[PDB]
Amino acid sequence: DFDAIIIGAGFGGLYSLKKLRDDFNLKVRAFDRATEVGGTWFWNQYPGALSDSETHLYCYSWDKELLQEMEIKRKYISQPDVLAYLKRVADKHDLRKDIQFETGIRSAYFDEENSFWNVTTENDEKFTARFLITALGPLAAPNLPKIKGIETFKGELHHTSRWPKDVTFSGKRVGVIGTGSTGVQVITAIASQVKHLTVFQRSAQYSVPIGNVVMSETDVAKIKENYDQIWENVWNSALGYGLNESTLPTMSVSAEERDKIFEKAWQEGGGFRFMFETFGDIAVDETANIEAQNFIKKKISEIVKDPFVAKKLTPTDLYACRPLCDSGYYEIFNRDNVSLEDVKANPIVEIKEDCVVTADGVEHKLDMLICATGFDAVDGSYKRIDIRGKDGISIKDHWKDGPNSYLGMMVSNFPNMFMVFGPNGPLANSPPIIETQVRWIADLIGYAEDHQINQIEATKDAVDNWTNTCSDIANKTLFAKAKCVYLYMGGLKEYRNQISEVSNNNYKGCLLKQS
Numbered sequence: 352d353f354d355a356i357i358i359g360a361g362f363g364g365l366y367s368l369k370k371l372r373d374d375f376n377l378k379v380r381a382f383d384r385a386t387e388v389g390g391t392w393f394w395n396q397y398p399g400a401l402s403d404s405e406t407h408l409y410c411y412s413w414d415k416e417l418l419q420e421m422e423i424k425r426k427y428i429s430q431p432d433v434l435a436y437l438k439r440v441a442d443k444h445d446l447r448k449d450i451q452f453e454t455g456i457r458s459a460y461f462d463e464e465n466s467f468w469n470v471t472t473e474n475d476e477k478f479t480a481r482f483l484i485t486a487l488g489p490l491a492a493p494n495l496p497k498i499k500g501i502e503t504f505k506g507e508l509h510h511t512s513r514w515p516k517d518v519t520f521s522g523k524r525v526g527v528i529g530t531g532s533t534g535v536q537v538i539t540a541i542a543s544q545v546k547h548l549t550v551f552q553r554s555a556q557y558s559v560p561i562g563n564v565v566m567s568e569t570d571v572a573k574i575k576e577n578y579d580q581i582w583e584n585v586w587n588s589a590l591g592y593g594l595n596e597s598t599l600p601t602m603s604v605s606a607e608e609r610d611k612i613f614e615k616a617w618q619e620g621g622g623f624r625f626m627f628e629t630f631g632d633i634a635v636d637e638t639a640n641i642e643a644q645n646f647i648k649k650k651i652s653e654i655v656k657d658p659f660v661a662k663k664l665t666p667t668d669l670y671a672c673r674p675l676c677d678s679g680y681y682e683i684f685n686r687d688n689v690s691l692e693d694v695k696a697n698p699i700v701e702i703k704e705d706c707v708v709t710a711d712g713v714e715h716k717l718d719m720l721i722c723a724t725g726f727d728a729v730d731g732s733y734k735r736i737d738i739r740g741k742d743g744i745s746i747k748d749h750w751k752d753g754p755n756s757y758l759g760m761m762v763s764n765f766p767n768m769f770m771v772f773g774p775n776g777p778l779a780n781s782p783p784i785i786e787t788q789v790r791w792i793a794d795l796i797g798y799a800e801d802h803q804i805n806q807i808e809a810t811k812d813a814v815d816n817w818t819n820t821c822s823d824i825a826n827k828t829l830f831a832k833a834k835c836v837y838l839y840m841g842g843l844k845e846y847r848n849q850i851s852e853v854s855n856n857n858y859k860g861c862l863l864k865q866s
């Protein structure tokens with residue numbers, strides 16, 4: 352028996368374990384298929400893996416001693432340094448004794464009599480616990496392409512989610528499929544190392560510089576001397592990225608100054624900065640979003656010297672959501688050993704034993720094929736586990752027509768269930784979101800321990816209201832008429848208030864059963 356069983360040992364699962372065990376004296380056990388904490392930062396070790404958020408903000412805020420002790424080597428933190436930080440979090444607080452590694456979760460069945468969950472691992476072992484917190488993160492199963500001939504490639508085949516150890520690049524003809532944030536980071540990292548690189552681009556996207564400069568002793572001292580300060584701005588901001596969230600409209604100024612505002616954010620770096628520190632209407636106004644696109648379009652023309660390759664790298668969408676961040680991505684295509692292949696116009700139809708064959712018939716002889724093709728949505732991480740709640744209804748049937756939840760943390764028909772970084776959550780930096788949700792969930796379990804209650808459940812009507820206020824805000828933006836499987840877009844501050852409006856009104860919209 353346990354009070355809580357944690358599924359996941361990443362950012363969410365680690366702080367969920369710390370809170371329930373140490374701050375509430377509960378008997379908790381965490382599980383993970385991995386052999387070490389980290390989550391996506393343990394699984395994804397591809398070349399160039401780097402955070403969207405800056406180093407001083409992509410961490411935990413609750414441990415003040417850790418913040419003053421934290422290493423800040425560069426403006427953004429690389430994957431090995433994130434794993435080391437999360438390893439130190441597990442070390443300093445002795446969490447590892449309460450996680451069982453190499454242990455997946457097959458089924459999670461809610462018992463309607465004693466009001467607890469039946470969690471069966473993949474080792475034919477099951478445990479019982481009143482509460483089941485689920486910290487599976489946003490990334491799910493790796494969406495690999497459906498290409499004829501995938502099995503016949505005799506060379507190295509790697510998807511970025513399962514990047515193996517000891518991969519050498521020199522002297523090899525390497526091909527990369529996918530031009531997302533993962534594909535961009537791999538391409539800039541390896542193009543200088545390979546004999547020839549081939550980029551199979553299905554859809555071009557906008558990418559801004561990241562500016563990952565080294566941090567000086569004075570820079571790190573300026574941050575740590577003012578750390579209580581930086582975090583208060585995070586809870587008061589909408590994105591939690593430490594940005595000067597602008598309200599100035601794009602078209603309410605001269606073209607000479609509009610170019611100055613874009614160029615300043617272009618020089619400082621960051622995808623969210625170029626979109627939300629510049630002006631405050633890029634994500635709502637059609638004219639504003641066009642202006643931001645043309646600045647990146649103009650930038651693409653200046654860097655890519657070949658106009659035909661520059662035309663290939665230019666996105667064709669009428670509306671653009673959040674761009675990517677890069678450390679010299681458009682600069683890569685100026686090299687003698689880099690070839691861009693518009694795969695939307697020249698699709699891959701077959702890959703033979705030693706090459707990739709596009710529709711035009713050209714065989715692209717590769718020694719190694721990297722798959723940076725992304726993953727599935729957040730619901731896939733849940734649909735992959737046999738979660739049966741009330742009536743024995745499985746998580747696949749209740750979410751068969753898209754995911755939904757109440758405050759992004761609880762589902763109807765699934766009582767005693769609390770989701771960390773679940774669907775219908777806020778669009779912001781993940782560590783502030785995870786800290787916000789683990790605090791809200793834990794204090795509700797504390798209210799549960801004190802008032803002698805054994806079953807909490809959200810109503811079907813509350814999750815309908817929550818999905819209505821999510822579409823309420825979303826339809827104010829062009830994120831519907833663009834690339835966009837649902838999100839709350841009111842900001843971190845409004846999200847912190849909304850769940851406080853619930854936890855103050857005696858948890859309105861939640862069923863509370865006594866025994």
Ligand SMILES: Cc1cc2nc3c(=O)[nH]c(=O)nc-3n(C[C@H](O)[C@H](O)[C@H](O)COP(=O)(O)OP(=O)(O)OC[C@H]3O[C@@H](n4cnc5c(N)ncnc54)[C@H](O)[C@@H]3O)c2cc1C
Nearest residue numbers: 359361362363383384390391402403404455456487488781
């Ligand atoms: C390279 C990279 C950079 C990123 N940068 C940013 C950023 O700058 N800002 C940002 O906000 N987000 C970023 N993200 C998103 C990232 O997923 C967040 O950090 C996320 O919150 C990770 O925390 P988590 O523990 O909630 O998710 P995860 O770390 O994905 O936790 C999931 C864990 O649960 C385990 N698990 C799942 N199902 C089962 C099962 N059935 N049985 C056993 N174990 C299971 C998995 O093994 C996994 O370890 C980035 C992601 C990547 C890959």
Ligand SMILES: NC(=O)c1ccc[n+]([C@@H]2O[C@H](COP(=O)([O-])OP(=O)(O)OC[C@H]3O[C@@H](n4cnc5c(N)ncnc54)[C@H](O)[C@@H]3O)[C@@H](O)[C@H]2O)c1
Nearest residue numbers: 401402403496529530531532533534553554723724725726
């Ligand atoms: N913080 C960071 O910098 C960072 C790093 C990695 C990932 N992420 C997040 O994780 C998610 C993973 O995204 P990702 O970078 O893996 O890519 P993605 O999920 O954004 O998209 C996959 C990419 O592969 C390409 N692709 C997919 N199927 C294809 C096919 N059949 N043929 C050719 N091309 C194909 C698409 O054009 C797309 O650009 C992203 O949503 C991102 O937000 C963030």
